Design a protein around this ligand. Structure first.
Ligand SMILES: *[C@@H]1O[C@H](CO)[C@@H](O)[C@H](O)[C@H]1NC(C)=O
Ligand SMILES: *[C@@H]1O[C@H](CO)[C@@H](O)[C@H](O)[C@H]1NC(C)=O
Ligand SMILES: *[C@@H]1O[C@H](CO)[C@@H](O)[C@H](O)[C@H]1NC(C)=O
Lengths: 324, 415, 236, 98, 49
C-alpha cells in the first residue's frame, strides 16, 4: 500500500494514517487468491496413492504407446506430445517495473512433479484396467481388457477377437494425425492464452495511472513540496491520496470477481478425470462424441489436455422386420 | 516472534507462516551533481566599470545562464556595506537564483542609509525606492579617488522638486518646470519657479560624508520556478556500487548508477521505456550514459512451530540474495528459489509436507529443531505384467467413511 | 501551381529516449495530404516572387534550388520604426542576427554585378533603441559555379522561437524527421513575415503551408529514430 | 464548538468517509453468498442419487463400490455416511482367450 | 461516459481528461458481457448438423 501511494516520503504517511485501516483490508483479500490457486491443482492431479512403472518389454498386442510415454533424452522426463504444447503458448517491462512494490510468487508444485503424476496414471491404466482406482492393482493382458470394455456397449467378444489386426492398424493411424494437427497450426491452444492476456493487461493500467494529477499542480510528489507553503500542500496532497486509493480498489474487486470462474472450471476437470479415465462412462456426449471406450491425460501450462477414444458405425443396409 | 503477537493482536500463535513487515535500506550519501558546465557570471562587468549612472536615471541589466561564484572579489574588491534580506549569507552557495536583476547608481556619502525598505529621504521619495517585500542583498563601497577632480565634478544630477511621492521600482525621467505658487509658470523660469533637477559637487578635499559612493542592488526569487543563475556544490564522481541520493539537472530520487551500452542522441537527454519510468540519464559534465536500479524493496515473514511448545522461529527474506541481508539485523544459511532461509539447516531424507514454503520445499519441527526438506510424492511400486497371467481376489471387506458440506450462513440487516 | 504534401513534415517534439515504443502524442502538425502554395522565381519573362504572407500559427518552409538565391526572411508586426523586428540575413560572409526597430523599403534585396561577388546590401535605413545582437563566425561560400532541399519550422510560444531543420539531397516523395537546430527567446508580437533574395545583375522554388491541432501515432526504432508515423483522422 | 455556516464543511468528510466504508462491506457480501449457493446445489444432488438409489458414477459416493448411504444433520451443514465394498487377498493364475 | 456525465458542454470535456482512463475501462466490461450472451444461446440449441 504505502510504497505504491506515498512513495518514500514521511510527510505522506502521517496523512495516510488518518484514513483508518485501508491496507490490512486490501492485503487480506489478495492473500486469499494465493492459497486457492495452489489448492486447485491438488485435486486434479493428486488422486493416485503410489507410483507405478511400465515393464521394459512392450508386447501390447499391436497397439503402439510410444508417443505419449516418457523418454530420457529431453529434460524433465516429458513425452513427445507434452513437448510440442509448451512451444505454442508464450508467457508474454517485467524486468524493472517493480519500482512501485509489485511481486510475483512461485507455485508450490514445480513443473517436474506434475510430469511424475501424469506418468503414473497413464502407466497404471494400461497394465491394470480400472481396478487400481478402487483397491489394489491387479494385472491383466491388454487384448482381454479391450474385450471387457468392448462388451459394455453392446457388441460381443468374437467381433473383437476376429478383427484384432484391423483395429490395431486403425488406432495406430488415428493417433498420429494429432501430431500434424498440433505441430503446424499455431492457434489450437486458444483458451489457454486469454488467462495470460487478461492478467498481464490489467497490470499495465495500474502502473500507467501513476502519472495523472487528479486536480493538483503536478503528478510528482516533489514539486508540490519544494515550492509550496507547508500549510498549503496538505490541501493538495490530500487530493492525490483519494485518487490513488480509488484506483487500487477496482483492481482488487475485478480480480476477486474474475478468479471465481477459474474455480468453476477446475471443479470440472476433477470430475472428468475421475469418471472418463478411472472407469467407463455411460452419460451421452460427456467424454467425447460417440460410444466411450477409454481415455488418456496429458499436461500443459496452466491446464490439462485429454484424449478420447470412441466407436462409430458405418455402411448401413435395408431389411424388413416383424414384432413376433 | 514478538512482532507476530503485535500483528494479529493476541497472546497465542498457531502453526503456520505469517507475513509481518518489509525490508528497506536507507541511502547514505546525498549528492548534488550540480551541472555548472557554463562559464562564470559577469562578476567584473557588473561591479566595476568606467562610468556609472545617476540617481534619477538608473540602469537595468539581465544576467542568466551562468554559475554563481563570488570568490573572485576577495583579491581586489573592498566593500563597505553588506546586508541581505530573505536569505542567509552562508547558504547562497547551495541555492539557485531566478530572474536576477542589477541596478547601478551613484549616491552621496551620508545618503547611503536610505537604501532599505521603509525609509524616507530625498532619494527615496523622488529618485529610487525599494519594495516592502524585499528579497536580496545591497552592497555599497567608496569611489572617492575614481570620481573626484579639482574644481568639482558636475555630471551627477538629482531631483529636488516633485508633486508627490514615488512608488517602488518606478522610474521618472521626465523633466519639466515646477510651479511652487498659485501663479502659473507658463513655461518660463522666474518667481516661485525653479528647475527640479539639481547638480552635485564633489571635491578631493571634501569631508567624510561628502564623497561619492557606488551601490548595486540585486533582486531574485527563491524556489518557485526554473532558475538559470545557480551555485555549485561539485560533490560529483560517485561510487558505482552503492545506493545513494542523486540530484541531476532535472531529476531527483535514489538508486544505483552504473555504466551502460546504449547511445543517447545529441538532441535527447533522458531515458524512458514502454512504461513511464525513469531508467537512464546522461552526465552533463562528462557526457556518459548511466543507469538506475532499485535497491530498497522486499518483504520478510516468520515461521513458527506452535507458540507454547517452543520459542524458536525462522525468517525468510523473499527474493533477496544471501549477501545483502545481514544474518541478523549466523552459521545457518540455506539458499532456495523463493528467498533465503536463515535459522534452519538442510537435511537429505524426504518426508511429507508440513508447512509449505515454495518451489518444492517444506519445513517441519522435529532435543528438537527446525528442518527443511524436499517433499516426496509417494511410495514406489511395479506391476508384473505378462501376456498370460491374471489375478483374482478371494475375500472382501466393508468400510464406512464421512463427508461434510456447508449449506447456509447467517442473515443480517443494517440501518 | 498547387500541390499537396503526401506525408512530409514531422519534427521531434520530445527530448527523451525510447526504444521500440509506439507511444502516441498530440501536438500541432500540418495535416496529411493538404494542398500548399507553389511560388516560382525563374528567368526565361523574368519572374520575381516575394509577397507578404500571414503567420497564423507557423509555416512549413521548404526551398528547392540549384544555387543559393534565398538568404533569409524578415519578420515583425507592421515592419516600421515603431515596432521591433527579428532580422535573419546571410551576407555571404556570416550569419547576421539582430532584434531592432528597422525601417524597410518596398523591395529590399541583395544582388551581384559579375568573378561573382556581392555588390549591394539594401535592407534597412534606420534602426535604433534595441538591445540584441549576434554575429556568427566568418566563412566563405562559393557563388553559382535541383539537387538539394532544406526544410524549416517556425513556432513562437511563451516568448520562445524554435527552429527545426534537416538538409537532404516539384518536391520528391521522401519522408524524414526534423530535429531542433536553434533556440532564441524574444518575447515579441509576430503576425507577418517576408523573404529577401538576390539577383545576378538583372532587373526583375519554395512552398508555404500551415498546421492544425491534430494527434498522430509515432513508431520509434531501436536507435530512437522515427521511421514511420501514421495519422488518426484521415480515413476510417 | 462551531457556528452554523462553518460546521457544514467540517461535517462533509465524516458522512463521505462513513459512506464509502459501507459499500465495501455490501460488495464483499454479494460474492461470499455466491460461493455457498454453488455448494447448496451439490448437496441436493448428492442426496437424490447416493441416498434414494444406487449410483454407478465412480468416486461420487465414497471410494470403492457403492452400496448405500445415511444422512445426518449438523449446525449449518450436513454429514453423510458412505458404505462400500473392497476386495482383498489376490492370487495368481493363467488365462487363455478361447 | 462522455454523454451521460456532462452532456455536450466543452467546459467538462477538458476537466474530465485529468482523471486517467476511468471511462475507457468501464466501456470494456459492457462489451465482454454482451458477447457471452450471444454465445450462451448457441450451446443449448445448435446441437444438430
Ligand atoms: C500448546 O501446544 C501443545 C503442543 O505440544 C498443544 O498440544 C496444546 O494444545 C497447546 N495449548 C493449547 C491451550 O491448545
Ligand atoms: C547429505 O548430503 C550431503 C551432500 O550430498 C552430504 O555432504 C552429507 O553428508 C549428507 N548427510 C547425510 C546425513 O547423509
Ligand atoms: C487543393 O487546393 C485547393 C485550393 O484551391 C483546396 O481547395 C483543396 O482542398 C486542395 N485539395 C485537397 C485534397 O485538400
Amino acid at each position: 500500500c504505502t510504497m505504491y501511494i506515498c512513495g518514500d516520503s514521511t510527510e505522506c504517511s502521517n496523512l495516510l494514517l488518518q484514513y483508518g485501516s485501508f491496507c490490512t483490508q486490501l492485503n487480506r483479500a489478495l492473500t486469499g487468491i494465493a492459497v486457492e490457486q495452489d489448492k486447485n491443482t491438488q485435486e486434479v492431479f493428486a488422486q493416485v496413492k503410489q507410483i507405478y512403472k511400465t515393464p521394459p518389454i512392450k508386447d501390447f498386442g499391436g497397439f503402439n504407446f510410444s508417443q505419449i510415454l516418457p523418454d530420457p533424452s529431453k529434460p524433465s522426463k516429458r513425452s513427445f506430445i507434452e513437448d510440442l504444447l509448451f512451444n505454442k503458448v508464450t508467457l508474454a517491462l517485467i524486468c524493472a517495473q517493480k519500482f512501485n512494490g509489485l511481486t510475483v510468487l512461485p507455485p508450490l508444485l514445480t513443473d517436474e512433479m506434475i510430469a511424475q503424476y501424469t506418468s503414473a496414471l497413464l502407466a497404471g491404466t494400461i497394465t491394470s484396467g480400472w481396478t487400481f482406482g478402487a483397491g489394489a492393482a491387479l494385472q491383466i493382458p491388454f487384448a482381454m481388457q479391450m474385450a471387457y470394455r468392448f462388451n459394455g456397449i453392446g457388441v460381443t467378444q468374437n467381433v473383437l477377437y476376429e478383427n484384432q489386426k484391423l483395429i490395431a492398424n486403425q488406432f495406430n493411424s488415428a493417433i498420429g494425425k494429432i501430431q500434424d494437427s498440433l505441430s503446424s497450426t499455431a492457434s489450437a491452444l486458444g483458451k489457454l492464452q486469454d488467462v495470460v492476456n487478461q492478467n498481464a493487461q490489467a497490470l499495465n493500467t495500474l502502473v500507467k495511472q501513476l502519472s495523472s494529477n487528479f486536480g493538483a499542480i503536478s503528478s510528482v510528489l516533489n514539486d508540490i513540496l519544494s515550492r509550496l507553503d507547508p500549510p498549503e500542500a496538505e490541501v493538495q496532497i490530500d487530493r492525490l491520496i483519494t485518487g490513488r486509493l480509488q484506483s487500487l480498489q477496482t483492481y482488487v474487486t475485478q480480480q476477486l470477481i474474475r478468479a471465481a470462474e477459474i474455480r468453476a472450471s477446475a471443479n470440472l476437470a476433477a470430475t472428468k478425470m475421475s469418471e472418463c479415465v478411472l472407469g467407463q462412462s455411460k452419460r451421452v456426449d460427456f467424454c467425447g462424441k460417440g460410444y466411450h471406450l477409454m481415455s488418456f491425460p496429458q499436461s500443459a501450462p496452466h491446464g490439462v489436455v485429454f484424449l478420447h477414444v470412441t466407436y462409430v458405425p458405418a455402411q448401413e443396409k435395408n431389411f424388413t422386420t416383424a414384432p413376433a | 516472534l514478538s512482532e507476530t503477537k503485535c500483528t494479529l493482536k493476541s497472546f497465542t500463535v498457531e502453526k503456520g507462516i505469517y507475513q509481518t513487515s518489509n525490508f528497506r535500506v536507507q541511502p547514505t550519501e546525498s549528492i548534488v551533481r550540480f551541472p555548472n558546465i557554463t562559464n562564470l557570471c559577469p562578476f567584473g562587468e557588473v561591479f566595476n566599470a568606467t562610468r556609472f549612472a545617476s540617481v534619477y536615471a538608473w540602469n537595468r541589466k539581465r544576467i542568466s545562464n551562468c554559475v554563481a561564484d563570488y570568490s573572485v572579489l576577495y583579491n581586489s574588491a573592498s566593500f563597505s556595506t553588506f546586508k541581505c534580506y530573505g536569505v542567509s549569507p552562508t547558504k547562497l552557495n547551495d541555492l539557485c537564483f531566478t530572474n536576477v536583476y542589477a541596478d547601478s547608481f551613484v549616491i552621496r556619502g551620508d545618503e547611503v542609509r536610505q537604501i532599505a525598505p521603509g525609509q524616507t529621504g530625498k532619494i527615496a521619495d523622488y529618485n529610487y525606492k525599494l519594495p516592502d517585500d524585499f528579497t536580496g542583498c545591497v552592497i555599497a563601497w567608496n569611489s572617492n579617488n575614481l570620481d573626484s577632480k579639482v574644481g568639482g565634478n558636475y555630471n551627477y544630477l538629482y531631483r529636488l522638486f516633485r508633486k508627490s511621492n514615488l512608488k517602488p521600482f518606478e522610474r521618472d525621467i521626465s523633466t519639466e518646470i515646477y510651479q511652487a505658487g498659485s501663479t502659473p509658470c507658463n513655461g518660463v523660469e522666474g518667481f516661485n519657479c525653479y528647475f527640479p533637477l539639481q547638480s552635485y559637487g564633489f571635491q578631493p578635499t571634501n569631508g567624510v560624508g561628502y564623497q561619492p559612493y557606488r551601490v548595486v542592488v540585486l533582486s531574485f526569487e527563491l524556489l518557485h520556478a526554473p532558475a538559470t543563475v545557480c551555485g555549485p556544490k561539485k560533490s560529483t564522481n560517485l561510487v558505482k556500487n552503492k545506493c545513494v541520493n542523486f540530484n541531476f539537472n532535472g531529476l531527483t530520487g535514489t538508486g544505483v548508477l552504473t555504466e551502460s551500452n546504449k547511445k543517447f542522441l545529441p538532441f535527447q537527454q533522458f531515458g524512458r521505456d514502454i512504461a513511464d519510468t525513469t531508467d537512464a540519464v546522461r552526465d552533463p559534465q562528462t557526457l556518459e550514459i548511466l543507469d538506475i536500479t532499485p535497491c530498497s524493496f522486499g518483504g520478510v515473514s516468520v515461521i513458527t512451530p506452535g507458540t507454547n511448545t517452543s520459542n524458536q522461529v525462522a525468517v525468510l527474506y523473499q527474493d533477496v540474495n544471501c549477501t545483502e541481508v545481514p544474518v541478523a539485523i549466523g552459521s545457518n544459511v540455506f539458499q532456495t528459489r523463493a528467498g533465503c532461509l536463515i535459522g534452519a539447516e538442510h537435511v537429505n531424507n524426504s518426508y511429507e509436507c508440513d508447512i509449505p514454503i515454495g518451489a518444492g520445499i517444506c519445513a517441519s519441527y522435529q532435543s528438537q529443531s527446525i528442518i527443511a526438506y524436499t517433499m516426496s510424492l509417494g511410495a514406489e511400486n511395479s506391476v508384473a505384467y505378462s501376456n498370460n497371467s491374471i489375478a483374482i481376489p478371494t475375500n472382501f471387506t466393508i468400510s464406512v467413511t464421512t463427508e461434510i458440506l456447508p449449506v447456509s450462513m447467517t442473515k443480517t440487516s443494517v440501518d | 501551381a498547387y500541390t499537396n504534401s503526401f506525408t512530409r513534415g514531422v519534427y521531434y517534439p520530445d527530448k527523451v529516449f525510447r526504444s521500440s515504443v509506439l507511444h502516441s502524442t498530440q501536438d500541432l502538425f500540418l495535416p496529411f495530404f493538404s494542398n500548399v502554395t507553389w511560388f516560382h522565381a525563374i528567368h526565361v519573362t523574368k519572374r520575381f516572387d516575394n509577397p507578404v504572407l500571414p503567420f497564423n500559427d507557423g509555416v512549413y518552409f521548404a526551398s528547392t534550388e540549384k544555387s543559393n538565391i534565398i538568404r533569409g526572411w524578415i519578420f515583425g508586426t507592421t515592419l516600421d520604426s515603431k515596432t521591433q523586428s527579428l532580422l535573419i540575413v546571410n551576407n555571404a560572409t556570416n550569419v547576421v542576427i539582430k532584434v531592432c526597430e528597422f525601417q524597410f523599403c518596398n523591395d529590399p534585396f541583395l544582388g551581384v554585378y559579375y568573378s561573382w561577388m556581392e555588390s549591394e546590401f539594401r535592407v534597412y535605413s534606420s534602426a535604433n533603441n534595441c538591445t540584441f545582437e549576434y554575429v556568427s563566425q566568418p566563412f566563405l561560400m562559393d557563388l553559382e559555379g535541383f539537387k538539394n532541399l532544406r526544410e524549416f519550422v517556425f513556432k513562437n510560444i511563451d516568448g520562445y522561437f524554435k527552429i527545426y531543420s534537416k538538409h537532404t539531397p516539384d518536391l520528391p516523395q521522401g519522408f524524414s524527421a526534423l530535429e531542433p537546430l536553434v533556440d532564441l527567446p524574444i518575447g515579441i508580437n509576430i503576425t507577418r513575415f517576408q523573404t529577401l533574395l538576390a539577383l545576378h545583375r538583372s532587373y526583375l522554388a519554395y512552398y508555404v503551408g500551415y498546421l492544425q491541432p491534430r494527434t498522430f501515432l509515432l513508431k520509434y526504432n531501436e536507435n530512437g529514430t522515427i521511421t514511420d508515423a501514421v495519422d488518426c483522422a484521415l480515413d476510417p
